[PDB]
Design a protein around this ligand. Structure first.
Ligand SMILES: Nc1ncnc2c1ncn2[C@@H]1O[C@H](COP(=O)(O)OP(=O)(O)OP(=O)(O)O)[C@@H](O)[C@H]1O
Ligand SMILES: Nc1ncnc2c1ncn2[C@@H]1O[C@H](COP(=O)(O)OP(=O)(O)OP(=O)(O)O)[C@@H](O)[C@H]1O
Ligand SMILES: Nc1ncnc2c1ncn2[C@@H]1O[C@H](COP(=O)(O)OP(=O)(O)OP(=O)(O)O)[C@@H](O)[C@H]1O
Ligand SMILES: Nc1ncnc2c1ncn2[C@@H]1O[C@H](COP(=O)(O)OP(=O)(O)OP(=O)(O)O)[C@@H](O)[C@H]1O
Ligand SMILES: [Zn+2]
Ligand SMILES: [Zn+2]
Ligand SMILES: [Zn+2]
Ligand SMILES: [Zn+2]
Lengths: 142, 141
């Protein structure tokens, strides 16, 4: 019924309604061919989102960023139209820049100091700002 | 192969890379099931985007908004899994506010002034701001 990917990545089992957030964070080149399924059937999740990206094999850094958005996705490496590998995003121990400290008065939001964070818990996800040492109350990609 | 739309809308022939902007302006309910194809083959346009929405038949207002973003779209109404009607957008001659002038120096972008544009050409689409007289370099709501 539709053009099957030859070479690329299929980010499957994304929590329903979060594919657009994931896609934005990945920030792929403008001419990239992509298929985005939102709120579609899932035997495992009931409903889910899917991101199919042609011609790109995500780098570790991008892969792991996804873990901060949807903790149970399956990264499917496609080659010759076949799934040759399934990866799970890793929640990093530390993060450079990337996120916004949710403390309005943090030195990183008042001065020119790049963000720095540390993950202190994976489930639930708890991220502490290195500088003000306050936990983020939300995950925000800068 | 993939699940088809049973009842809803298939917005076809969207200019490549513009489906997300179109989807954003439609602002559909959070639980809406959707399929977005970006930069896919098209005999008619070489490359294009396609937006498929289950459970929603776009209202005229939305239809005409889409055209400003992508003038050659085809609105396909789906019922019982079949395209029962093929709609073409109507491009207005004038526009009140709605769009943001793409000229940073325009008064509308420095003071709180209600935008106003004139469509001087639909093929190709040329939208002129009444205040600064400059043509939009992009359709922004
Ligand atoms: N070449 C391809 N082009 C586009 N989509 C593909 C391709 N290969 C498989 N997929 C997608 O990758 C995902 C996983 O494929 P498979 O690994 O075939 O699913 P499962 O359903 O067998 O995997 P899970 O058991 O879901 O990991 C599915 O969502 C599938 O539609
Ligand atoms: N390119 C696509 N366009 C439209 N719908 C799609 C596309 N690819 C996958 N789907 C739909 O996504 C749903 C899940 O397919 P898969 O992901 O194939 O189910 P599973 O049952 O393999 O998923 P679980 O592994 O159950 O999440 C199906 O309804 C399928 O038709
Ligand atoms: N029930 C459906 N579910 C999902 N997609 C559909 C469904 N019916 C048809 N479409 C899509 O709607 C668009 C128009 O269908 P048709 O009108 O069948 O295509 P054409 O290619 O025959 O139309 P054009 O000649 O492209 O207007 C196509 O992109 C088609 O794949
Ligand atoms: N849900 C989908 N998932 C992935 N790819 C899709 C999906 N629906 C359609 N496509 C792709 O969109 C492209 C155009 O299909 P159609 O829209 O069927 O072509 P046309 O030749 O009918 O288009 P024109 O009418 O030529 O734009 C094809 O490559 C098709 O496989
Ligand atoms: Zn599956
Ligand atoms: Zn801080
Ligand atoms: Zn067609
Ligand atoms: Zn202006």
């Amino acid at each position: 019924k539709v053009k099957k990917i030859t070479n690329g990545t299929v980010i499957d089992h994304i929590d329903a309604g979060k594919a657009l957030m994931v896609f934005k964070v990945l920030n792929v080149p403008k001419e990239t061919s992509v298929m985005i399924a939102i709120n579609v059937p899932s035997k495992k999740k009931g409903k889910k989102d899917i991101l199919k990206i042609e011609g790109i094999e995500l780098k570790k850094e991008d892969v792991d960023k996804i873990s901060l958005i949807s903790p149970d996705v399956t990264i499917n490496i496609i080659r010759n139209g076949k799934v040759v590998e399934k990866l799970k995003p890793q929640i990093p121990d530390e993060i450079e820049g990337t996120l916004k400290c949710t403390n309005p008065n943090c030195i990183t939001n008042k001065e020119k100091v790049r963000g720095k964070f540390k993950i202190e818990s994976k489930n639930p996800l708890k991220i502490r700002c290195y500088y003000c040492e306050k936990f983020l109350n939300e995950v925000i990609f800068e």
